[PDB]
Design a protein around this ligand. Sequence first.
Ligand code: CLA
Ligand code: CLA
Lengths: 157, 84, 162, 99
Amino acid sequence: PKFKPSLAWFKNNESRLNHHLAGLFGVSSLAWAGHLVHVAIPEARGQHVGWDNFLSTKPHPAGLEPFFKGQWSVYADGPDSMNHVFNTSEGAGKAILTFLGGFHPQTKSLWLTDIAHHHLAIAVIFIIAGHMYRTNWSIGHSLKEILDAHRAPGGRL
Amino acid sequence: KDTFWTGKVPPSTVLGIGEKVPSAAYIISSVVCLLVGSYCVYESNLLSPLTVTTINPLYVLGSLLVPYSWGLHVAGWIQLKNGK
Amino acid sequence: SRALPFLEAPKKLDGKIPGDAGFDPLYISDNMNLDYLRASEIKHCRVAMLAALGYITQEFFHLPGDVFNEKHALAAIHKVPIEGWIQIILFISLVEIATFRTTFSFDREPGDFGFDPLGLAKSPQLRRRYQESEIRNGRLAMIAVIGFIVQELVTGKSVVEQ
Amino acid sequence: GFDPLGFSTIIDLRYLRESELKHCRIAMLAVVGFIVMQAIGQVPISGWIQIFLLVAILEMIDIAAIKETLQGNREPGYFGFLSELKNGRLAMIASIAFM
Ligand code: CLA
Ligand code: CLA
């Protein structure tokens, strides 16, 4: 009884869209880029990272110093070579974010550093997109107001 | 606010926070935004290829003035035709 | 509101209930079941206070035997016997199952499971003073214990040593 | 009455006042800060993050505060904490010159 949501809660379109875009899509995508950078990419280069050691193991030697100094190109330097043997250090790189394109020659699959960067980039777009609609602070759009205004003036619609 | 309108011209209230802004402000700012934005795109991408070490944040930010200029010129027309 | 003296407090927070300083800038209380939130805050208060006391004491003092002689609190987890943990879990479990009905009934008052062995809150006016102070010490302990844990993770030193 | 361009007609004056008093206060603390470029780099990044993390929250709460002002439940620039304004305006012009 005391936890059944009201009908008004279920028809709060603007809040739901803000949260689903920025949170459900955006933050989930950002967290996945986190997984890839902290775990998947090290493991691909032969390094164990788990719950036991992940707080002490930097994804990149430079840490977050380049991030807060806006020297973001540091994270692209030194990709996996074309002779990288997956799950080993042989031919392994240090880059955590790249835009190589195409396939890892051994695994015949998209580069993990490209996939991490994909997810980081769309996370930003989704988080920005989820500030469009008006909730409790007057800024933003009403869905009803957008819809009512979209009539072609020539009258064909 | 009911934003439904009839005839050939929307009624200024569609511009939201920018409803009281004059027509000339929108029209001039739209030209400036288009030219600066076009310049940013040109400098970033077209004058020599883009590289990992030649990404200027200002040109990336400046490129957003191109879609923004579109909005500004629509708002300008709306105000022009409403008398504002 | 009081805590944020330039903003107004939400509608639910009138300034009657214990712990009310009108501090809800997001207006969470408008959507959330407040009675349950109060019970949840008081529960976190009580767990944190025990945890805060536990953290500082078991640094200094120790139960007999080599197993219970670890000054670092987070290092003590893996040393202590599993069968020991199972008994604590089963104990906590039994308490939570016993109290479950009361929590979702909302008949009694948040945090109230009729536990006053010594009869310290005899007067209603004393109860009020105790109820506010429970939340105050609890809120303080909630920050502190998170302070302690994060500090250990970062440094690797028990609260007193660091 | 100094508004040649006419921003007070376009945008609400209450909002502009909040913006003015904010510039005034930030500028003055900076003017005093400058007196009392390298320090941007020298100071650790962890410390700088904490400054940003506290300006944020204060500014997030200011969004809720601006709502109260524009609804008419708060004086522009009041956080319950002409001389301010005049000295502030001077400090703002001064702060540019130092930067
Ligand atoms: C941060 C805030 C937040 C979050 C995380 C959620 C999350 C959720 N809400 Mg929402 N909700 C919110 C705020 C939030 N809500 C608010 C404020 C309101 C009120 C305004 C609501 C009102 C609301 C209602 C009324 C309902 C939900 C529901 C849901 C669930 C949708 C079903 C699902 O699991 O999709 C998961 C979707 C994704 C993870 C998105 C990804 C999918 C797209 C297609 C991208 C491509 C996928 C990608 C390539 C994946 C590869 C996977 C791998 C196998 C390789 C989801 C758990 C529904 C529900 O099921 O409730 C139980 C529901 O009925 N919400
Ligand atoms: C022929 C195409 C066309 C035309 C003539 C119109 C015309 C109109 N639109 Mg519509 N619109 C269209 C297509 C079109 N639209 C499309 C394809 C979309 C996306 C689905 C929209 C989404 C849309 C929204 C959400 C709104 C309108 C509104 C309007 C009306 C006011 C325009 C205005 O205020 O400009 C002035 C606009 C600006 C000065 C802003 C510039 C445009 C944006 C911000 C650029 C994007 C920048 C970037 C992605 C976001 C910032 C990122 C970062 C900096 C944070 C006007 C009748 C408004 C309305 O209906 O009022 C009730 C309104 O709120 N339109």
